[PDB]
Amino acid sequence: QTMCSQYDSASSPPYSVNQNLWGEYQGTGSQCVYVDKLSSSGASWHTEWTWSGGEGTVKSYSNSGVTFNKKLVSDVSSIPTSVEWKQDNTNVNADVAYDLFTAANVDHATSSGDYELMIWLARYGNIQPIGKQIATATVGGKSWEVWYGSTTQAGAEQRTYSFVSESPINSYSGDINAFFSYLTQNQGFPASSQYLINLQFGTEAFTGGPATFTVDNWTASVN
Ligand SMILES: [Pd+2]
Ligand SMILES: [Pd+2]
Numbered sequence: 577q578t579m580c581s582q583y584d585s586a587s588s589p590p591y592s593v594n595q596n597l598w599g600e601y602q603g604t605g606s607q608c609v610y611v612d613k614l615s616s617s618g619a620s621w622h623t624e625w626t627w628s629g630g631e632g633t634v635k636s637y638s639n640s641g642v643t644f645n646k647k648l649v650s651d652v653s654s655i656p657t658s659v660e661w662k663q664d665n666t667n668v669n670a671d672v673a674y675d676l677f678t679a680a681n682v683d684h685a686t687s688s689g690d691y692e693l694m695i696w697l698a699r700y701g702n703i704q705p706i707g708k709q710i711a712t713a714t715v716g717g718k719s720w721e722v723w724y725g726s727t728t729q730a731g732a733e734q735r736t737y738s739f740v741s742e743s744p745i746n747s748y749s750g751d752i753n754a755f756f757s758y759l760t761q762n763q764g765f766p767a768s769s770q771y772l773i774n775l776q777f778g779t780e781a782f783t784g785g786p787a788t789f790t791v792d793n794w795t796a797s798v799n
């Protein structure tokens with residue numbers, strides 16, 4: 577659809593495609609999100625965009641998500657997921673990433689919580705993760721840079737762990753739970769007291785364009 581509004585959702589349980597321009601007031605430009613194929617078996621979609629000014633600030637996060645029942649990270653058996661995407665015009669400042677949120681209380685909004693786990697499949701321009709690199713780890717057969725940082729806004733101190741690949745991975749498959757398992761044994765992540773609440777995948781656009789981000793297919797499940 578031309579659901580190029582501020583916040584829009586198209587869902588076919590348990591999947592959804594979400595247009596999210598939560599930074600539309602920091603720069604200037606336009607962005608629409610189009611659904612190509614959406615059913616209970618997966619999501620395929622694309623978004624075109626152009627943004628200027630307010631560099632260093634994410635203007636939007638178009639993404640596909642999967643709805644599921646809040647459950648303790650330590651109770652998660654596996655998070656299988658696969659994706660195939662492509663970025664048309666790399667002369668921009670944006671990233672392609674999986675975004676996972678956990679909170680110490682399921683009775684908390686899904687916008688944040690305590691921890692955010694970003695798995696960067698691509699990094700364009702001069703943008704970089706929050707905080708500093710604290711390690712490099714091998715997860716799911718691949719090498720990732722582990723970054724850690726914590727931002728506090730409106731009193732919401734949020735801890736972010738970012739796994740970044742050296743080069744773009746257009747075709748990825750893996751068990752995301754492996755990242756949680758790594759964080760629990762190597763970075764003190766409190767798995768037995770954190771509820772996985774949100775799982776999304778998409779792109780954060782800072783500046784640049786016209787550019788097109790396409791997700792040929794996307795699947796994700798939380799067990
Ligand atoms: Pd649209
Ligand atoms: Pd289009």
Ligand SMILES: [Pd+2]
Pocket residue numbers: 675692694736
């Ligand atoms: Pd992030």
